[PDB]
Design a protein around this ligand. Structure first.
Ligand SMILES: [Zn+2]
Ligand SMILES: [Zn+2]
Lengths: 285, 44, 158, 100, 123, 62
């Protein structure tokens, strides 16, 4: 009987960015989306390296770490199976279901040094690849005669176990602002005072009129909720010339992704896993 | 069953696919934990 | 439960903590709370809170106060009578506010609670009051910026 | 483990109040539920607590009027929330399409 | 159901301030009754000027005769407290003190340690 | 040490950019008129580049 009815309205979308504007819901929903995106939407990334000839200057466990953090395309992530489940395997090598292996090999045999980048990781499922963006993520540098040869086993995980496996470079929201200027107290101020009210705003929300020379909010979106314009007013005397307070439905969310999962399908994928969560806590009867 | 010094694999568990070496009671290739597990949980 | 009375100073050795005092001060600064906030703090209490302080108003509905939260944090039955606070069955009557007298007041309160019932009741009261206060502050936040260390050039010349 | 994810324990002293323990959940679930339990007339008190900050378990307490039992409300909320999400999914999907 | 009814006029403000971040202990006097009453009220939500007229009522229960808390909706302001000292009336609404100087005849029906309510309305 | 793969605060992937920092800097770009054109905009991320000591060039030579 009681049920909110949220309503989205996207403003920019790309494969990495997305700025949608939810209206009509409680913050407790948006926070939940944030939180779950940051740390449940699953992704696939490397999780057991096995090295056979390191000759480089960097030790083995600094090659491992570095490898894991590399972002690996994982559209298939939600359909795999956390290894700890899959009982179709001993946990080694490709298992269509749970793991995908990535051999890498390099040895410098010239003079000028060879950057073992990431475009040199080759895989065997042609789905899980490394994400391409213009040259890739140096994993080591090798000088003549030095060699690296490794075989790795990717797996699927949730970013609450390590952040190798987390698909977001910051998701965040801003209670959209509501600004009301008293417009008659603001007639009291002399021109100068105004132009020292304008320019006490850290960002730029406010702005003078060409003509009437009145403060005219000119971008409500950019108001970090500092208290500066307000407190300058108090000091100038006139209190409450400007009062600015959160609207407490409208949010403006901004998701950005590591590239593993497109932005779109990060959000949709969150909503989906939330449902699957909720629908496990029903107490039946 | 097996013998001292063998290289086996942890089939099922939180530590799956890890390779380990059987001190007597297996020991992992690069971590300091000495775990003990039955034969059903170990593979070549 | 036996070394509470100090053989050196005579008062309870379980003195006040920095975070505890800070949270209590920033909580007493705002006498009235919201509905969801009040319910979320009581959760860490011991018993429920049937009666609300502020029933109906112009814009606010059921609004509680920090006094009832301290009451539900207090033991079941107690009678302090320390010339400044009265309690009768987990029902605080008055609570004075000052600059530093709150610490002495709560010290007298805990000493009376210890001498009346026992040490276990005081231990339970502390174990029920500490996480509640830690949670109260956490929502609010406290920090010091560069504005707090203001030179006030006029006062500087003075 | 297999202990039921959700468990119910009636509170003896106060009628129409009970506590539910949900294992393996945290503030993502608790805050969403709490705020919808507070959208209901019948419910009187609602909150969640983590028993210790380091253990993943939440305990949720609901006190309700005579008109509804605690269990009814809890279940109602979840159902309601789910239905909300579906509205959003549908909405989002519509928009992405439009953008393209 | 109402045990007491009286109209009070704002006589004086004890703290002599408006936004001192504390509850104001307003002092009022009765009309044609010669009774002085002190009360702590939240001024940020309920504005009160100097020398204002407002109605005040006492009620043990809001609904009909029976269990406390049909409901009185005429009073926009409400408080919950408990009387603790019959002798001058001394009642605190969960920390907010209230003092009365009424004659004993008009407040003879009050019992010790009872649950009461404070209904207030700005005429 | 070699540029870390991902910023340690927000997890952006910056480990792709070292070279184009340096290059741009070897034109005439104030750091920060460059770190902008590499499009890093939060300051958790403009740290990790402005404050990295390379140390692999050397470790290779010796
Ligand atoms: Zn498998
Ligand atoms: Zn960052």
């Amino acid at each position: 009987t009681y049920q909110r009815f949220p309503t989205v309205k996207i403003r920019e979308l790309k494969d990495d960015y997305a700025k949608f504007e939810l209206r009509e819901t409680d913050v407790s929903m948006a926070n939940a989306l944030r939180r779950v995106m940051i740390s449940e939407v699953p992704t696939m990334a490397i999780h057991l390296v096995k090295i056979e000839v390191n000759s480089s200057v960097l030790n083995d466990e600094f090659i491992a770490q570095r490898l894991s953090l590399i972002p690996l395309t994982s559209e298939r992530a939600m359909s795999m199976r956390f290894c700890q489940d899959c009982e179709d395997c001993n946990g080694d090598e490709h298992c269509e279901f749970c793991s995908v292996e990535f051999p890498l090999s390099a040895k410098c045999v010239t003079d000028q040094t060879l950057d073992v980048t990431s475009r040199d990781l080759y895989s065997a499922d042609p789905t899980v690849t490394p994400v391409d963006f213009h040259k890739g993520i140096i994993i080591a540098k090798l000088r003549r005669g030095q060699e690296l040869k490794l075989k790795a086993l990717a797996r699927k995980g949730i970013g609450k176990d390590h952040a190798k496996w987390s698909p977001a470079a910051t998701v965040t929201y801003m209670y959209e602002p509501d600004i009301i200027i008293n417009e008659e107290m603001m007639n009291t101020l002399t021109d100068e005072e105004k132009i020292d009210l304008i320019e006490s705003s850290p960002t730029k929300v406010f702005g003078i009129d060409p003509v009437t020379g009145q403060v005219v909010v000119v971008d409500p979106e950019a108001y970090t909720y500092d208290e500066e314009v307000i407190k300058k007013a108090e000091a100038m005397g006139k209190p409450g010339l400007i009062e600015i307070h959160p609207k407490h439905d409208s949010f403006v969310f901004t998701v950005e992704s590591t590239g593993a999962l497109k932005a779109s399908q990060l959000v949709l994928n969150a909503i989906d896993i939330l449902k699957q969560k909720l629908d496990a806590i029903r107490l039946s009867d | 069953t097996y013998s001292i010094g063998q290289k086996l694999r942890i089939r099922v568990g939180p530590l799956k696919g890890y390779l380990c070496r059987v001190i007597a009671t297996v020991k992992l290739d690069s971590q300091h934990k000495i775990f003990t597990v039955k034969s059903e949980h170990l593979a070549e | 439960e036996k070394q509470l009375l100090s053989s050196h100073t005579g008062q309870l050795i379980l003195q006040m903590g920095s975070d505890s005092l800070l949270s209590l001060r920033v909580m007493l600064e705002r006498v009235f709370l919201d509905k969801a906030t009040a319910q979320q703090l009581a959760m860490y209490g011991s018993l429920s809170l049937p009666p609300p302080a502020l029933r109906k108003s112009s814009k606010s509905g059921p609004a509680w106060t920090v006094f009832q939260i301290l009451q539900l944090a207090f033991p079941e039955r107690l009678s302090c009578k320390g010339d400044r606070f009265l309690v009768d069955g987990s029902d605080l009557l008055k609570f004075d506010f000052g600059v530093d007298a709150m610490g002495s007041i709560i010290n007298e309160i805990v000493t009376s609670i210890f001498l009346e019932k026992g040490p276990k009741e005081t231990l339970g009261f502390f174990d029920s009051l500490q996480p509640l206060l830690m949670e109260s502050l956490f929502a609010e936040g406290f920090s010091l910026s560069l504005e707090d260390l203001s030179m006030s050039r006029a006062d500087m010349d003075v | 483990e297999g202990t039921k994810k959700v468990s119910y324990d009636r509170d003896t002293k106060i009628i129409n109040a009970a506590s539910f323990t949900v294992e393996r959940e945290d503030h993502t679930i608790g805050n969403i539920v709490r705020m919808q339990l507070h959208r209901d007339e019948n419910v009187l008190f609602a909150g969640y607590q983590l028993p210790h900050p380091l253990k993943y378990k939440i305990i949720v307490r609901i006190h309700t009027t005579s008109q509804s039992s605690p269990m009814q409300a809890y279940n109602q909320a979840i159902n309601d929330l789910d239905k909300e999400l579906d509205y959003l999914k549908n909405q989002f999907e519509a928009e992405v399409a439009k953008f393209s | 159901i109402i045990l007491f009814e009286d109209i009070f006029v704002v006589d004086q403000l004890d703290p002599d301030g408006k936004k001192f971040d504390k509850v104001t202990r307003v002092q009022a006097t009765s009309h044609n009754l010669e009774m002085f009453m002190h009360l702590d009220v939240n001024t940020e939500v309920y504005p009160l000027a100097v020398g204002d007229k407002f109605t005040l009522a006492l009620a043990p229960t809001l609904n009909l005769d029976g269990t406390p808390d049909t409901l009185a909706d005429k009073y926009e302001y409400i408080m919950h407290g408990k009387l603790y000292k019959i002798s001058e009336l001394y009642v605190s609404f969960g920390g907010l003190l209230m003092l009365l100087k009424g004659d004993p005849a008009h407040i003879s029906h009050f019992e010790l340690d009872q649950r009461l309510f404070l209904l207030m309305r700005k005429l | 040490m070699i540029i870390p793969v991902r910023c340690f605060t927000c997890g952006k992937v910056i480990g792709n950019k070292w070279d184009q920092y340096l290059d741009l800097l070897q034109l005439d770009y104030t750091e920060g008129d460059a770190l902008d054109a590499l499009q890093l905009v939060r300051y958790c991320c403009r740290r990790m580049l402005m404050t990295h000591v390379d140390l692999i060039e050397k470790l290779l030579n010796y």
